[PDB]
């Protein structure tokens, strides 16, 4: 029943998916032993969306874990909720990537991708009516940004009809963690515009800013970080799992948010986010939600959404709300933000309703938008790439594995072209 299958590669996506599956298991009342102890019948009509049924009355997530080294995967199998996954969905290499895009995409990646392709295939014909694919990865590393995107290209090749979305952890110029992000970042983003139907971006720096300013938590770790991104993960697919007054599948979100085939990069946000003090002090209301979920400092990337104009926007309310308050809030915030929204298309905002609030919450809002403010991140990426490419720094370990400067040049040119065609809409007038 329009089920979706999860794949993740590299320790980044591994952590993201591991915590996302914990969130979904908590929501559906599934123990780490894989046995259901929920309260409702309503948790059981849509179990097939994410969980397959096995012998003994237990459920298994339909997720694939891929990596070029077994360390992080041995960590996740030992972590909590590690017993849900079948032992057969673990695939690992003995070499690793070493932040080398060529190693993860050409030499080790190509020879290892056969098994992961086979398992994802057999699982895909496993389901009755396949709905789509979701991928979680980071473009700033080697194994993820290479092997994941190679699998993206392959899967898009054999399934041109299905819908596919990816969640990209991109390098931030401020918070630097490796010396050579821009090269493989550009290499990956080049191969995304042609295949990925949906791509939505997350940034560690701005997500830190969220944790330290809104949550005001003194010493955050990666755990609550992944918790926020996983809440964003789960908030979008609520309608496909629960009844609601306005159902909306991923295809509807796509066709309703994207005007042109090459503008499929998205900015997301989650509400209500509050500090540990005022939980009992602030009233949860649709006006307060709609106010917070359009706060620019509520987004999870360093891009400032006040620096451009929104093309399309969408809000997916969860919980029992009246439709009008949503409608008038959307129209009023549209009217008093005319200068910050594109003019040539009227009513560029989606409102969708699902009547199941999250665990421990009464209402929630997930925002997804397409704006001309995302391209500033690609200006930083392009400037860094050009600066470190002019002197040919670190080029030669790439080119010693069958690479040459042709692909680097074409990727750089294509990304600049994307930036140009994305910015020319900012000042366009009808």
């Amino acid at each position: 029943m329009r089920e979706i299958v999860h794949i993740q590669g590299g320790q980044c996506g591994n952590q993201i998916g591991a915590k996302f599956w914990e969130v979904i298991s908590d929501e559906h009342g599934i123990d780490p032993t894989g046995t259901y102890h929920g309260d409702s019948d309503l948790q059981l009509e849509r179990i097939n969306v994410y969980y397959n049924e096995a012998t003994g009355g237990r459920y298994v997530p339909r997720a694939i874990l891929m990596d070029l080294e077994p360390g992080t995967m041995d960590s996740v199998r030992a972590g909590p909720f590690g017993q849900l996954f079948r032992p057969d969905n673990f695939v690992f290499g003995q070499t690793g990537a070493g932040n080398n895009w060529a190693k993860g995409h050409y030499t080790e990646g190509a020879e290892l991708i056969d098994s992961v392709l086979d398992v994802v295939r057999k699982e895909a014909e496993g389901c009755d009516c396949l709905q789509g694919f979701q991928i979680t990865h980071s473009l700033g590393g080697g194994t993820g940004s290479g092997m994941g995107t190679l699998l993206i290209s392959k899967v898009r090749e054999e399934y041109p009809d299905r819908i596919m979305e990816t969640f990209s952890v991109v390098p931030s110029p401020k918070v630097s963690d490796t010396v050579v992000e821009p090269y493989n970042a550009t290499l990956s983003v080049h191969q995304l515009v042609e295949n990925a139907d949906e791509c939505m971006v997350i940034d560690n720096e701005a997500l830190y800013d969220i944790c330290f300013r809104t949550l005001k938590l003194t010493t955050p770790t990666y755990g609550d970080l992944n918790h926020l991104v996983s809440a964003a993960m789960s908030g979008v697919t609520c309608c496909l799992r629960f009844p609601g007054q306005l159902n909306s599948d991923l295809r509807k979100l796509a066709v309703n948010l994207i005007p042109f085939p090459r503008l499929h990069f998205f900015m997301i946000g989650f509400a209500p986010l509050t500090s540990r003090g005022s939980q009992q002090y602030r009233a949860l209301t649709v006006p307060e939600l709609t106010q917070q979920m359009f706060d620019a400092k509520n987004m999870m990337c360093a891009a400032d959404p006040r620096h451009g104009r929104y093309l399309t926007a969408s809000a997916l309310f969860r919980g029992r709300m009246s439709t009008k308050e949503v409608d008038e809030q959307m129209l009023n915030v549209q009217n008093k933000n005319s200068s910050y929204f594109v003019e040539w298309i009227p009513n560029n905002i989606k409102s969708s309703i699902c009547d199941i609030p999250p665990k421990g919450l009464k209402m929630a809002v997930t925002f997804v938008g397409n704006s001309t403010a995302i391209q500033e991140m690609f200006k930083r990426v392009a400037e860094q790439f050009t600066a470190m490419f002019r002197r040919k720094a670190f080029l030669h370990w790439y080119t010693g594995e069958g690479m040459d400067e042709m692909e680097f040049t074409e990727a750089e040119s294509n990304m600049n072209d994307l930036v140009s065609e994305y910015q020319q809409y900012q000042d366009a007038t009808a």
């Binding site: 007054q245 298309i345 009513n347």
Partner: protein, 432 residues
Amino acid sequence: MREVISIHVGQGGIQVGNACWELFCLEHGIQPDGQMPSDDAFNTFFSETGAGKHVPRAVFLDLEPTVIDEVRTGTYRQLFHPEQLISGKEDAANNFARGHYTIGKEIVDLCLDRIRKLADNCTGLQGFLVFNSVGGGTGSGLGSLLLERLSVDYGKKSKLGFTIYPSPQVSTAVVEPYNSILSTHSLLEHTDVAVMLDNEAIYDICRRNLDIERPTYTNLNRLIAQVISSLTASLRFDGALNVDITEFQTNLVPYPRIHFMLSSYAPIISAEKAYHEQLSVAEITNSAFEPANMMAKCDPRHGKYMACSMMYRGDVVPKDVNASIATIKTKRTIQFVDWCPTGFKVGINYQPPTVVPGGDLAKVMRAVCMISNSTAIAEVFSRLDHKFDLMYAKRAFVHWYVGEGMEEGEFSEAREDLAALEKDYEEVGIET
């Protein structure tokens, strides 16, 4: 002996069907489980199974199964016929092309087979009613395929469309103008009578009269249900002036191209202030023609009137109805067209309106439901044409249509077809 077949396509069609048939099953005294407590006025809507329960003469269509199986788990799992709740596998995702050119055929054939079976049992079929939302992909597309299929399967049989168009500013999607224009193109040459059912105007009505700041779509479905019941009570209840559905395409349609109109109802009142007011026939007639009481976002003051079919239920008096009509004609701010000297069609029913427990409306002894066809309805078409072409100029959102199997040209023929329709309305309005 007389029956009418109901079709509920699209999500909005489903949620309006639930409320309408709850209203009818309560007012007919039949329980949700399906059998009469026993402690020939139902043949129009319910059909005896031979011994005990009654079989629905309704059909439900949608490409996504959540609403269908939710209803199957609802209170009417014991009422509805099993596989008349036809459900698909993949949602059309707000795409007219998906519902009209790739996956609509795998379900339209089943629906036509079902309607063959339902019509075969029926012996005195009067007509068809269709419920759908325009701004939805599967709704519009499947409603289209059904309409051209039934247009050649039956032909002369009458059909009425209680259709929901998107509101001017209060709307949810971004791409609804496209499939709206295509749906209107499909239905303007196939629908005998089509009414406006936008949402924000009735929302305003509820806020003004019921004094509520927080209603939801359920109240809308219930009130549309009550309007349908008021319209259809004439075929199943005794009255001094009975009006059939066949007296719609002969009294409300001056020209074949002009078959779009708007509905209104009175009185709307809560249970707190109902006993402290008059609620006279003259007052409920006057309030029915009040411009803000229109169920559609259309100003009757900006256009002429052509034909109004207004029906009373309760203990109304024909002399009082005639006096109210005389006062309405005496009033100046309502002006009719010159070539139509008489333009009122009145029916009288003796059955008082039903009240559903837990609903907003109170128990009343008089009620009137009015359907008006006016030349001012072109404003919504003009504004929808603007919302269409401003984003239609530069090939926006078009490839998700064309690469799905849609041809790029149909939007054009829709454009000049709606332009000619608007020209027709503004040509009719001139004096002779």
